Amino acid sequence: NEDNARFLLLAALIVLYLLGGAAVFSALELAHERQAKQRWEERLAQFSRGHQLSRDELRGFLRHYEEATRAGIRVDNVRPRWDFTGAFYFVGTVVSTIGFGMTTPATVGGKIFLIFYGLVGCSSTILFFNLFLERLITIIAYIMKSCHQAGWKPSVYYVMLILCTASILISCCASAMYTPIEGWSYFDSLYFCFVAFSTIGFGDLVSSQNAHYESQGLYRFANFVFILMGVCCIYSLFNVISILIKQSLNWILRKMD
Amino acid sequence: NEDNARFLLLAALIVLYLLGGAAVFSALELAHERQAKQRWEERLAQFSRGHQLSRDELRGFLRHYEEATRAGIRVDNVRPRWDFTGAFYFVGTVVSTIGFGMTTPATVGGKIFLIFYGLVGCSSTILFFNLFLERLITIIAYIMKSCHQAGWKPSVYYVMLILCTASILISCCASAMYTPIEGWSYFDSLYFCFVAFSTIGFGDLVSSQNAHYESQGLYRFANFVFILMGVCCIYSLFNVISILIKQSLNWILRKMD
Numbered sequence: 377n378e379d380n381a382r383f384l385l386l387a388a389l390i391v392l393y394l395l396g397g398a399a400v401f402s403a404l405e406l407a408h409e410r411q412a413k414q415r416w417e418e419r420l421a422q423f424s425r426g427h428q429l430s431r432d433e434l435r436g437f438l439r440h441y442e443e444a445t446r447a448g449i450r451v452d453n454v455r456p457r458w459d460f461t462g463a464f465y466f467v468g469t470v471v472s473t474i475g476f477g478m479t480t481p482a483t484v485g486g487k488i489f490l491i492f493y494g495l496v497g498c499s500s501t502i503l504f505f506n507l508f509l510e511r512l513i514t515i516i517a518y519i520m521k522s523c524h525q526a527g528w529k530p531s532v533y534y535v536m537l538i539l540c541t542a543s544i545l546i547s548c549c550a551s552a553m554y555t556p557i558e559g560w561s562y563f564d565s566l567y568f569c570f571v572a573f574s575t576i577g578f579g580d581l582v583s584s585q586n587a588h589y590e591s592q593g594l595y596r597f598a599n600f601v602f603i604l605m606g607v608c609c610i611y612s613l614f615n616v617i618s619i620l621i622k623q624s625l626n627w628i629l630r631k632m633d
Numbered sequence: 634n635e636d637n638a639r640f641l642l643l644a645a646l647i648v649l650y651l652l653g654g655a656a657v658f659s660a661l662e663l664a665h666e667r668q669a670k671q672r673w674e675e676r677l678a679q680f681s682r683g684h685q686l687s688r689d690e691l692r693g694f695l696r697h698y699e700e701a702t703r704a705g706i707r708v709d710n711v712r713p714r715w716d717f718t719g720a721f722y723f724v725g726t727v728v729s730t731i732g733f734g735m736t737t738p739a740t741v742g743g744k745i746f747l748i749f750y751g752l753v754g755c756s757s758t759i760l761f762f763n764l765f766l767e768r769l770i771t772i773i774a775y776i777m778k779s780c781h782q783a784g785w786k787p788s789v790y791y792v793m794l795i796l797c798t799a800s801i802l803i804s805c806c807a808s809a810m811y812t813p814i815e816g817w818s819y820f821d822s823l824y825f826c827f828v829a830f831s832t833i834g835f836g837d838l839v840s841s842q843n844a845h846y847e848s849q850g851l852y853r854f855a856n857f858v859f860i861l862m863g864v865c866c867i868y869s870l871f872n873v874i875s876i877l878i879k880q881s882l883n884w885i886l887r888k889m890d
């Protein structure tokens with residue numbers, strides 16, 4: 377009966393959390409959306425009136441451009457898709473369940489292979505993350521025992537603090553490189569780092585997609601290393617916080633009578 | 634020493650898997666990409682020649698259109714963002730780490746709140762999935778014991794088979810709709826179902842945004858229910874397959890002596 381009660385309580389809390397977040401986000405973003413839409417409408421009217429064009433022709437042209445954008449054509453000199461390096465980037469985003477969306481299959485035959493490839497690879501990546509967390513806990517215990525000098529296993533709180541510090545340090549180090557090389561601001565770099573490391577992957581900001589990129593040999597290697605370490609650390613942090621939340625739910629159930 | 638060897642072996646296998654997948658995907662998609670690019674170039678040249686517009690003006694117009702698209706403007710009629718239900722959809726995609734990308738924050742203040750909101754919600758969702766898997770295993774054991782009529786826990790193989798069957802059934806039932814409602818093909822519907830249920834979320838196909846949507850009350854409820862069940866089942870399947878892969882790694886390590 378305890379397990380069922382815990383399940384039901386967690387479901388109700390998640391529902392309330394979703395409702396509150398929806399209200400807050402709407403209140404934050406509605407006015408900016410409306411202003412942007414009005415600005416676009418004014419620009420489109422100005423362009424249509426300037427060159428004595430018609431709106432149906434512009435609609436057809438924009439539909440063709442949407443198709444071209446889906447194909448991969450951009451406005452500012454992007455790197456080619458579906459070469460060996462681009463395919464490596466695509467499979468890297470697929471196996472980690474990030475899914476930026478900058479490159480997607482378009483043919484029948486590529487989609488079946490995507491289904492089977494992902495089905496086989498995602499589980500292996502999850503196993504890799506679990507083994508990494510176990511190794512990190514073991515090395516932390518060994519270091520603590522050696523410094524004091526099995527039963528020296530650290531508590532959950534200290535592991536959480538260490539993971540938080542490591543995540544912050546890695547994010548700052550990665551942003552310090554993303555900021556100059558790209559045309560991004562520091563806060564935007566931190567936002568991109570959080571979105572990528574959590575395996576959410578909105579796709580609004582994607583790195584290493586500018587055709588000629590100076591050295592271009594070390595940059596891709598550094599990008600790969602940074603993304604891998606960030607994903608591992610953030611996943612471990614999520615698991616530890618989930619354990620703590622479960623303990624809190626147990627306390628809430630015990631208190632209520 | 635065994636743990637370190639298993640870690641190293643898994644890393645090497647994943648690297649080889651990535652290389653092979655990259656080669657196959659490139660060989661599958663390069664020609665289609667090139668054909669699409671040539672088609673777009675021909676269309677753009679035709680339009681520019683026809684309407685006597687210079688290249689730079691068209692480039693500026695397309696840059697403005699990209700800026701407008703980033704805020705939610707489309708050539709077809711779509712539902713507004715950030716009213717109250719778009720926010721519900723956005724937070725639902727955020728907490729489950731799907732990240733379609735059809736709606737993203739654009740203001741300073743909405744990005745910090747996103748960071749903290751996701752940090753707190755993703756762990757709760759992971760805990761919910763784990764509790765669901767435990768409950769499903771327990772109910773399977775109880776049903777098996779009752780049919781035969783603790784020590785009646787099923788093997789991993791039977792759980793994997795049951796999860797596979799449930800995933801296939803849910804995917805087919807969900808694809809029964811989305812086919813006439815949005816005018817998709819059946820294979821495209823299955824592809825979208827797999828991409829969404831695995832929490833990859835490319836964003837090329839997104840459901841339930843066409844402004845007027847007939848009933849629009851039951852359709853959203855059904856969409857929510859279907860996505861929730863699919864995500865739960867596919868995550869459970871991933872965990873079981875990871876356990877099996879770990880057993881296989883142990884076997885091959887033992888064989889190597």
Ligand SMILES: CCCCC/C=C\C/C=C\CCCCCCCC(=O)O
Pocket residue numbers: 461464465468469471472501504584596597599600603604607644645647648
């Ligand atoms: C060596 C350890 C093996 C484990 C690998 C597991 C998962 C891969 C995870 C993340 C890779 C992120 C994609 C970045 C690729 C960029 C390459 C480029 O910019 O061209």
Ligand SMILES: CCCCC/C=C\C/C=C\CCCCCCCC(=O)O
Pocket residue numbers: 387388390391718721722725726728729758761841853854856857860861864
């Ligand atoms: C009642 C169980 C509580 C647990 C909820 C946990 C996670 C939510 C997961 C998936 C929902 C994503 C789909 C959002 C669709 C919104 C519906 C619409 O407007 O089209």
Ligand SMILES: CCCCCCCCCCCC
Pocket residue numbers: 461464596597648
């Ligand atoms: C341009 C870089 C493409 C290849 C980079 C992958 C390097 C991974 C091999 C080292 C880990 C064992």
Ligand SMILES: CCCCCCCCCCCC
Pocket residue numbers: 391718721850853854857
């Ligand atoms: C238009 C639909 C918005 C609200 C739908 C959410 C329904 C889930 C709440 C009931 C389950 C506890």
Ligand SMILES: CCCCCCCCCC
Pocket residue numbers: 380384387
């Ligand atoms: C005792 C059974 C009560 C039902 C619990 C399930 C509620 C959540 C379903 C999504």
Ligand SMILES: CCCCCCCCCC
Pocket residue numbers: 511515
């Ligand atoms: C006992 C050896 C543990 C190996 C740790 C691997 C390094 C992790 C951070 C790069």
Ligand SMILES: CCCCCCCCCC
Pocket residue numbers: 549552553556
């Ligand atoms: C151009 C400045 C780039 C600095 C990157 C090095 C950060 C330290 C990593 C250990």
Ligand SMILES: CCCCCCCCCC
Pocket residue numbers: 591594595598
């Ligand atoms: C222009 C310098 C870009 C590469 C810096 C990263 C060096 C490797 C650090 C691991």
Ligand SMILES: CCCCCCCCCC
Pocket residue numbers: 637641644
């Ligand atoms: C003896 C342990 C050497 C470290 C193995 C791990 C190296 C790959 C980590 C990415």
Ligand SMILES: CCCCCCCCCC
Pocket residue numbers: 768772
């Ligand atoms: C003992 C009852 C636990 C609830 C099982 C139902 C989960 C699936 C509902 C769709």
Ligand SMILES: CCCCCCCCCC
Pocket residue numbers: 806809810
């Ligand atoms: C037009 C929709 C026909 C299919 C709806 C039935 C879905 C299966 C519900 C169990």
Ligand SMILES: CCCCCCCCCC
Pocket residue numbers: 848851852855
């Ligand atoms: C036009 C009918 C669309 C809604 C069908 C789904 C009914 C709810 C089934 C759970």
Ligand SMILES: CCCCCCCC
Pocket residue numbers: 392395396399
């Ligand atoms: C905690 C509930 C938030 C208020 C809901 C508003 C619905 C219009």
Ligand SMILES: CCCCCCCC
Pocket residue numbers: none
């Ligand atoms: C462009 C090919 C690079 C190959 C990397 C080395 C493979 C181990």
Ligand SMILES: CCCCCCCC
Pocket residue numbers: 484485486488489492
């Ligand atoms: C065009 C045939 C592709 C086959 C995909 C791989 C099947 C497992």
Ligand SMILES: CCCCCCCC
Pocket residue numbers: 548549552
């Ligand atoms: C170890 C380097 C700390 C991060 C430097 C930040 C510089 C903007």
